[PDB]
Design a protein around this nucleic acid. Structure first.
Lengths: 32, 122, 198, 48, 130
RNA sequence: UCGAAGGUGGGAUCGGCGAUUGGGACGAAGUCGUAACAAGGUAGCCGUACCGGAAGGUGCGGCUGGAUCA
RNA sequence: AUCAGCUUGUUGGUGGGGUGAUGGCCUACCAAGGCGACGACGGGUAGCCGGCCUGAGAGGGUGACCGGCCACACUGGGACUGAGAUACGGCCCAGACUCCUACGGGAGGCAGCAGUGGGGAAUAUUGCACAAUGGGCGCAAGCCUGAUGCAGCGACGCCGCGUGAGGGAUGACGGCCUUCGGGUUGUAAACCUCUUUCAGCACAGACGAAGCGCAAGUGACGGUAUGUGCAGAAGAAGGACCGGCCAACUACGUGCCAGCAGCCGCGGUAAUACGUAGGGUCCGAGCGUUGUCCGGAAUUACUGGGCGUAAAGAGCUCGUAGGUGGUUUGUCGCGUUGUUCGUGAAAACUCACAGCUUAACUGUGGGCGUGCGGGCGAUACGGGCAGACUAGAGUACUGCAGGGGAGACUGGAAUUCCUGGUGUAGCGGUGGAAUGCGCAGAUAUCAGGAGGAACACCGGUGGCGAAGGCGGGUCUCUGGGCAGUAACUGACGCUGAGGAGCGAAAGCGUGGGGAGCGAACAGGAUUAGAUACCCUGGUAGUCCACGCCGUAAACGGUGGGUACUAGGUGUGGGUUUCCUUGGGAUCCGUGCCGUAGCUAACGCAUUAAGUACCCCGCCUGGGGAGUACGGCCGCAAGG
């Protein structure tokens, strides 16, 4: 179809990836 | 689809989709009103809407709209909030009854007459 | 469609034969972007018919509303369509499909009334039916439900035609209640016809 | 309208041990002989 | 190969839709009875049973009208494996208001809807043809 | 012998509140850029990795939902 | 199943015990089962039903009145009495609470009918009778009965009746519009006759009682219902709405304000959409709003939907339960079907009829009670059992094609470095340049050496593999496919929830290897500024061995199987009839064009998205979000 749907989805995915970069450490230690 | 697949598991309805969380499945709830501030709607409709957030007896914190020209209610009035729908300010879906326990009916209202609670001329 | 009531001292309004039943179903202004703006035109879906059960379907394109209605009248005039009945009912339950238009046309006992939505109600009120029971499933439109209703009336056939296809002596094609309804409807055709001769 | 094949693990009572696994036994309803042993079997048809 | 009769009526809808003169089939008992019913109601013209690779075969010639137009205006298998549709005597489902017929295989053999009505027996449907 | 309540004990599980913090939705109007839509001015997108104030950029493989045609 | 295992009187046996009665109900011993993806054990909510509401029906919602069952009686245990016990107005104990006490100790129990406080948007009188019907005791009279019969209260609901009728003008007064002519309110009003139900005031006054009673009386409702009288239009209309859907429009007043709105949307000084007025429309003792449910919604599609691109085909296979099953003979009668018996209380529902001034309402008689059990009958189809068959499926035999896979050994061209020649000032790079390598001997060329990776040409719309994927050569081991004959087996088939296995690239672990390319990382340039493209360098990586991970636009965006449905032309594998390599015919493969048919359209179109059957996956507006919480796998990234 259009690539707009694909790109909205991918924006969400990207943002999430970044959010796991920055909290990586914090999730390990707060979880442990 | 492949009717044994429906014998296994399938074909249930979706979700009740409850409209109002006032509580209990009750039509109107009296409430203590607080902070009667006036707001700004969405972009095609610009005005100042006269809302008041109300703590329903049902312990929940909601924000109701006050229909009519003006509101008799000040801070700490016992307003009787029914459920409605105002599109125009987001998150305000309740309307305060006018002509009720505390908030008096709309004065010189002569045509609408059941809503806005104006009693008949003597 | 306004300002039609008029008295003219001119040559003629040209009122004449074929006083048929004519129904205008819908009109939606159809726009077209060209260089510097929009060009508005008009579409009128015109149903014509007589109370025998002959139906037309016309589709008028013009940039005036009575012009589009008149062109739909002439186009349905050019293209009629025969519908077979029993009395004033329909023969048997059908489903018609015009690519998304689903319409179920089911017969009923007489007196019930034409129960259908407005497009199918138009095509059946122009026609020779008075008591059938339809429904418009899918496509939620006027053009596809009119054209789907006419395709549904193309899936109709006589009891006799069915008997002929199978080379069987009727009785042997219908069941008996519907043959009795043939006797009732042809009997009232005889009563109103012989009252028509005198 | 699907004709469902269903199973029913009943429990049953052999005094003489005439049946074994895989057999085609009959059944008949009795008095409640213990906590869910409510069947006794007479005229076992086929053995394995 | 999962349903025999669906391949039978399927082959009659394809050979009927594509303007064919005859059709060839693996002969069986139930297809012979359905072919005999569609003989007796006149939806097909006649069938003949051949001997062939290993087994017998069913060659049905189809009955057309005053031009190329068709007598069987459809088939639809209803008593299909997985939802075999049963019918009490109260209603042998009427088909196309009665103009179509319903091949119903009662305990007396294979009948039509009308024969299942008058003789007072029901117990199946099979495909019904109009 | 059994035994309700009571007492001691360590857990399951359902929630309420919590300084601070993550993101989310809406707001107009603000600041910064201009990533995408035309070959959108480096074709776009998928997976993954790395990096970057942000949109993003690059690598490796893939894909036409790509273009003009050497 | 974001709850997968639970159970030790737990599963069965024997001897006792207990009970009105069978029994892990209980007990001693012995045996060791039992229950679970047809959801066990846990969690959440819930009295169940005749019914009620909605609906064309199928179904959805609900369990108020009336009726039938069940459970409980301040909270939690226990027995006793008795024909019979959750013993509401019994007992015993322990609690929590209210109250009396001379402090030693007692008393309580509206979830009976009234009634009070509280909670709440909200739900009635501390009524009168046992006259009727039911119940108890009594030989009977009779006594008891907040069951019941009635009454009060609330438009809380359903139905019926009233607020007058007939006459009445080229259409008054007043009102508001106006094109300044008039037009509307309006036959409506005033007036003129007439009639009075229902309220009002009078007098008469029930049936309910073929009852009870041996007493003479007896109706709570009741001086009610209802009669017959009297006076007189006499005492009696309101609410919503008039942009669109959706019956019904004009003026005045504010002009992005004040407000409206079910959605679409109306307000920026000429709004039929806001407020007021006229007028209209729709209902009417009511009319609007809010809430809750069904409907429309075929919008969870059994009846009755879908999955190339709109939401939707698991990355791909193998296979457990399951679902489904070619040809044919027999038998059983489990599914199916026919018929009769029993039952589905009454009420309701539907049809007819009777009763109340009518109706709601009530009663009588049918039907309904879509079901279930028993007896008797049928055997086509499904199934079970016992057989038979060769077309599906698999095997043998003869060939044939192939970058199918793994292991091992080896080949040359090219790039880079190295040593040595020959030989000099530039080379490299770009849109144009500069960092850079050079002048210590570079680039260039010749000879030799090292080492790694990738395989030019053949080679493409071509082959093989289940899908990823697979191309230097040779050898070794091994997998699948196709055709031909029909030798064998004789339905062994299909699919496949969970499950195991394979699964590009990137990434991960340990150990090697490291030429070229190269994220990150530098400098140069461009630019307003480049954390970018372009340039020069460059580490992990790319490579091999052994494992992880499990993802992709893993795409034909098309699950697997099967049968059929006009053709035309390429090319890949193999059999055969004819000309004699050419053509035909055939089985399997892969492309391009094309009818019918299909589709929302583009398109598909014998390699279907066509016509049908079988099984699986999956979808239910967009965001929030393939995210949180929880669990599982993983070294981590993460899935």
């Amino acid at each position: 179809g259009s690539v707009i749907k694909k790109r909205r989805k991918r924006m969400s995915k990207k943002k999430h990836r970044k959010l796991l970069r920055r909290t990586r450490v914090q999730r390990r230690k707060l979880g442990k | 689809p492949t009717i044994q697949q429906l014998v296994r598991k399938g074909r249930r309805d979706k979700i009740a989709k409850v409209k109002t969380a006032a509580l209990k499945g009750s039509p109107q709830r009296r409430g203590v009103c607080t902070r009667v501030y006036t707001t700004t709607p969405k972009k095609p409709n610009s005005a100042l809407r006269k809302v008041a957030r109300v703590k329903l007896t049902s312990q929940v914190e909601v924000t109701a709209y006050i229909p009519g020209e003006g509101h008799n209610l000040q801070e700490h009035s016992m307003v009787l909030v029914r459920g409605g729908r105002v599109k125009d300010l987001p998150g305000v879906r309740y309307k305060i009854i006018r002509g009720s326990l505390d908030t008096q009916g709309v004065k010189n209202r002569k045509q609408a007459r059941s809503r806005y609670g104006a009693k008949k001329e003597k | 469609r306004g300002r039609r009531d008029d008295r003219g001292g001119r040559g003629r309004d040209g009122g004449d034969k074929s006083n048929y039943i004519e129904r205008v179903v819908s009109i939606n202004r159809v726009s077209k972007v060209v260089k510097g703006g929009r060009r508005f035109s008009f579409t009128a879906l015109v149903i014509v018919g007589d109370g025998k059960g002959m139906v037309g379907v016309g589709y008028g394109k013009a940039k005036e509303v009575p012009a589009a209605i008149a062109k739909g009248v002439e186009e349905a005039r050019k293209n009629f369509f025969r519908v077979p009945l029993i009395g004033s009912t329909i023969t048997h339950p059908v489903q018609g499909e015009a690519a998304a238009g689903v319409v179920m046309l089911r017969p009923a006992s007489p007196g019930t009334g034409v129960i259908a939505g407005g497009a199918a109600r138009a095509v059946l009120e122009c026609a020779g039916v008075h008591d059938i029971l339809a429904k418009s499933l899918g496509s939620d439109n006027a053009i596809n439900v009119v054209h789907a209703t006419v395709a549904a009336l193309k899936l109709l056939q006589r009891p006799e035609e069915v008997a002929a296809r199978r080379g069987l002596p009727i009785e042997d094609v219908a069941p008996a209640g519907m043959l009795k309804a043939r006797r009732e409807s042809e009997a009232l055709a005889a009563a109103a016809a012989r009252e028509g001769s005198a | 309208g699907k004709i469902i094949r269903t199973t029913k693990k009943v429990k049953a009572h052999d005094e003489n041990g005439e049946a074994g696994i895989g057999d085609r036994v009959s059944l008949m309803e009795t008095r409640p002989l213990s906590a869910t042993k409510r069947w006794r079997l007479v005229e076992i048809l086929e053995k394995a | 190969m999962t349903d025999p009769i669906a391949d039978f009526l399927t082959r009659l809808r394809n050979a009927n839709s594509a303007y064919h003169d005859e059709v060839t089939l693996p002969h069986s008992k139930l297809k012979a009875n359905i072919a005999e019913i569609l003989k007796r109601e006149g939806y097909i013209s006649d069938y003949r049973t051949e001997d062939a690779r290993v087994g017998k075969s069913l060659v049905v010639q189809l009955k057309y009208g005053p031009s190329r137009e068709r007598s069987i205006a459809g088939l639809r298998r209803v008593s299909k494996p997985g939802l075999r549709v049963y019918a009490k005597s109260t209603n042998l489902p009427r088909v196309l208001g009665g103009l179509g017929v319903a091949i119903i295989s009662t305990s007396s053999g294979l009948l039509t809807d009308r024969q299942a009505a008058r003789q007072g027996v029901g117990g199946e449907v099979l495909a019904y043809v109009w």
